[PDB]
Design a protein around this nucleic acid. Structure first.
Ligand SMILES: [Mg+2]
Ligand SMILES: [Mg+2]
Ligand SMILES: [Mg+2]
Ligand SMILES: [Mg+2]
Ligand SMILES: [Mg+2]
Ligand SMILES: [Mg+2]
Ligand SMILES: [Mg+2]
Ligand SMILES: [Mg+2]
Ligand SMILES: [Mg+2]
Ligand SMILES: [Mg+2]
Ligand SMILES: [Mg+2]
Ligand SMILES: [Mg+2]
Ligand SMILES: [Mg+2]
Ligand SMILES: [Mg+2]
Ligand SMILES: [Mg+2]
Ligand SMILES: [Mg+2]
Ligand SMILES: [Mg+2]
Ligand SMILES: [Mg+2]
Ligand SMILES: [Mg+2]
Ligand SMILES: [Mg+2]
Ligand SMILES: [Mg+2]
Ligand SMILES: [Mg+2]
Ligand SMILES: [Mg+2]
Ligand SMILES: [Mg+2]
Ligand SMILES: [Mg+2]
Ligand SMILES: [Mg+2]
Ligand SMILES: [Mg+2]
Lengths: 155, 135, 141, 85
RNA sequence: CAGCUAGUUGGUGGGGUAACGGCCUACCAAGGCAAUGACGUGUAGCUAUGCUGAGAAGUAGAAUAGCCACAAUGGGACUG
RNA sequence: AUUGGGCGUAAAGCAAGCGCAGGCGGAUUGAAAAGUCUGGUGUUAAAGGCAGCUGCUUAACAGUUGUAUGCAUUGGAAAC
RNA sequence: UCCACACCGUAAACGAUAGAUACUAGCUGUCGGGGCGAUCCCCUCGGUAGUGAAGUUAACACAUUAAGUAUCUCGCCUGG
RNA sequence: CAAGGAUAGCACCGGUGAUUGGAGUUAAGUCGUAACAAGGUACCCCUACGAGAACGUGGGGGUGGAUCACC
């Protein structure tokens, strides 16, 4: 049940020897709401083929996401170009405090309660890149225990 | 910049200017001083009525009026309606606004509140134009 | 132990060590050396205790007039370090003082915060246990 | 007995060019309201050299408040440490 | 807005004030503040608080409550 | 943009230097304790804010209990 | 336009990149001191260039002479 | 002792003013074509002189310049 949702449908174009070639570009986010989510941007002369190619790319590039108590473990800032997205853990009940591309990414990934803020640009592809970078840079509290020879997150 | 630099010369915030300055000047008329007291809408008296041409794209004849308020400021105000009873000398009641076509105009005339008659022959959005309910 | 190259250090003792550690981490370098000060010695002792470094070793000249500390980072088998980032708080000029009530928690407890309250440098958790705070040197996670 | 204690200020004499006076200067390190950094300030208080204290120029002097002896004079000199200049 | 201040700064005797005090008086001195912002100009009752903001804080000082000042304008004084 | 921004090509490195005051500043020892941390005490009027409860047919509202912040003094800590 | 003596004090006065300090792959030239002793070539310490990974950047590009990791101080910017 | 009155010269601020200078905004005005390509004389910066006007020329400075070219 890999649900998908459309984030942006731009109308890009080039110029030829007389006239303009117009193609639709779609930014699709595919997620199973259990820990797998990817993104795919595709261009085609028509919306259906563009959506098909974007879904194919999103399913080709899937990333693994780990959740702690339905939320993100520690506060992080994802950077990608001029877009910086701040994610912050939330207690169970606040729900998704995200809006737009971040909200799409978080819901399709499976997180329940996240605090988010877009501190930079508002271009959906770069916001998605920053969000994915922030979630991917995350550290589990068992990898750090293995690294520092602590006792499975014990004090 | 630097903590010492900001300690010496702190951050100065950019100023904020109003969009309808002429509505916030009050003349005492006894001591003859003008004070800055904010007022939503103000009464004025027209001096010259006529038409202007919209800036680049639009093409029309839009009804303006050179109205002098209860203070000593004379402003160009757009009459918002189809047909008017302005006779180059009347009392109107201006409110804030900004028509994009005419440069220099930054006020509107409330219709059907004072000497200026309301806009009849209107059943849609009439409460903005001052029209009695058909009933 | 014998050396060949001259050894220099910055005037700021916390950020000198932080710059050395961060550059070594980014460049995959393992062993680095610097001039030894007692603040740096104590801070390296607590880093070794918390398990962010393999070893730190102080040395003195033959005339007992100069001391230098050399330490190695703890890399795993696939050569990726245990340190992920360093950020200094109490920089020169603007010194950061926080009471116990506002003692920070770095990365929801994953990292550590170096606090030099009254008994030398001290980790955030032990500072919370002792219910007393002070100068906050750097964030290491 | 129990007597309420006056406030004290320690400073360094900056100048003395009148009759029975010594314009002393006191420094403080008040924090900045916003950037939270200590700032060195300077204020020139005045006192009187009534006697037995002299306290010529350059003398590090302790100062205790008192009932106003005159306009702009509300302080008197006390123990002097590091006698120099 | 770069100099301002001649009761302005300090000392002696006396007077006056509920009280200390150039508050006033006679004499003797030239000092006092100021680039860490005097002085000048403009504006404003101050505060607890109201509204807003995740926070740091922004903004107004409704009602009410604490304090100050005024009673057409400008001075003086009796009773207490 | 202290928390929380920048200055090659988008607004922004003075044409360059000698530099007083200011800001910052190598290593070790001792003292004091001005900053820093912490304990006791006094105070920060009432109303307002937040939490709990009672009464108005429930609410708005009223009442009631708890609830911080800063300053001063005194007693300790000595890492910066 | 040139010379002497007095001013003016501006330039695309540009590396369009303030100064100081510590750290971070390498390769190819060239200039100066020092070590060996025909040149040539080798090593060390510095100056000035090209190429180039990590790293940074909106991109061009910078890349141990940084526009990289950081600190200190000064100057400057806040739509046309 | 002293509010106020009269006289007098300085200090700061405000309104207005014949006439005059420039500026912005303006669907379809006149004169040229200065700039963007080597924009047809490469451009730009400081400066001096001159001309209806964009601008022209002298002095110095830059590449934020086209072609050129090397096995
Ligand atoms: Mg053709
Ligand atoms: Mg005296
Ligand atoms: Mg006296
Ligand atoms: Mg905000
Ligand atoms: Mg009130
Ligand atoms: Mg009122
Ligand atoms: Mg009256
Ligand atoms: Mg009486
Ligand atoms: Mg910016
Ligand atoms: Mg520029
Ligand atoms: Mg320069
Ligand atoms: Mg310049
Ligand atoms: Mg120098
Ligand atoms: Mg100096
Ligand atoms: Mg030191
Ligand atoms: Mg209270
Ligand atoms: Mg109540
Ligand atoms: Mg210039
Ligand atoms: Mg040059
Ligand atoms: Mg290069
Ligand atoms: Mg402007
Ligand atoms: Mg041309
Ligand atoms: Mg030309
Ligand atoms: Mg002619
Ligand atoms: Mg000519
Ligand atoms: Mg020329
Ligand atoms: Mg000729």
């Amino acid at each position: 049940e890999f649900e998908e949702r459309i984030v942006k449908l731009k109308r890009i174009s080039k110029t030829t020897k007389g006239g303009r070639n117009m193609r639709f570009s779609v930014l699709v986010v595919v997620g199973n709401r259990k820990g797998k989510i990817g993104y795919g941007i595709a261009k085609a002369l028509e919306v259906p083929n563009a959506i098909k190619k974007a879904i194919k790319a999103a399913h080709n590039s899937l990333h693994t996401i780990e959740i702690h108590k339905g939320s993100i473990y520690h506060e992080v800032i994802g950077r990608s170009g001029a877009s910086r997205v701040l994610l912050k853990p939330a207690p169970q009940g606040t729900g998704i405090i995200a809006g737009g591309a971040i909200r799409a990414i978080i819901e399709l990934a499976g997180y329940s309660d996240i605090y988010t803020k877009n501190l930079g640009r508002n271009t959906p592809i770069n916001m998605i890149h920053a969000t994915m970078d922030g979630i991917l840079k995350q550290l589990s509290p068992r990898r750090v225990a293995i690294l520092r020879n602590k006792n499975l997150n014990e004090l | 910049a630097t903590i010492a630099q900001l300690i010496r010369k702190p951050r100065k915030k950019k100023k904020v200017k109003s969009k309808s300055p002429a509505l916030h000047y009050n003349l005492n008329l006894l001591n003859k001083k003008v004070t800055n007291v904010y007022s939503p809408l103000k009464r004025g008296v027209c001096t010259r009525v006529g038409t202007m041409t919209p800036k680049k794209p639009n093409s029309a004849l839009r009804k303006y009026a050179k109205v002098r308020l209860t203070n000593g400021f004379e402003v160009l105000t757009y009459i918002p309606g189809e047909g008017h009873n302005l006779q180059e000398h009347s009392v109107t009641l201006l409110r804030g606004g900004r028509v994009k076509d005419l440069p220099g105009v930054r006020y509107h005339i409330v219709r059907g509140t004072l000497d200026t008659v309301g806009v009849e022959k209107r059943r849609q959005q009439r409460s903005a134009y001052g029209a009695k309910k058909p009933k | 132990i014998t050396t060949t190259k001259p050894i220099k250090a910055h005037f700021d003792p916390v950020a000198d060590l932080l710059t050395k550690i961060n550059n070594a981490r980014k460049a995959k370098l393992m062993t680095v050396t610097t001039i030894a000060s007692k603040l740096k010695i104590a801070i390296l002792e607590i880093l070794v205790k918390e398990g962010y470094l393999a070893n730190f070793q102080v040395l003195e000249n033959k005339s007992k007039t100069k001391r230098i500390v050399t330490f190695n980072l703890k890399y795993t088998q696939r050569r990726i370090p245990s340190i992920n980032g360093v950020k200094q708080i109490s920089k020169p000029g603007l010194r950061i003082y926080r009471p116990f009530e506002k003692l920070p928690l770095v990365l929801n407890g994953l990292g550590i915060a170096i606090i030099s309250t009254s008994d030398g440098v001290m980790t955030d958790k032990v500072a919370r246990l002792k219910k007393i705070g002070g100068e906050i040197l750097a964030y290491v996670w | 007995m129990k007597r309420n204690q006056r406030k004290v200020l320690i400073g360094i004499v900056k100048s003395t060019k009148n009759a029975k006076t010594a314009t002393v200067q006191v420094e403080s390190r008040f924090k900045h309201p916003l950037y939270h950094k200590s700032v060195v300030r300077h204020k020139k208080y005045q006192a009187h050299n009534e006697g037995e204290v002299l306290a010529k120029d350059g003398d590090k002097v302790q100062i205790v408040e008192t009932r106003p002896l005159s306009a702009t004079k509300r302080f008197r000199i006390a123990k002097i440490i590091e006698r120099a200049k």
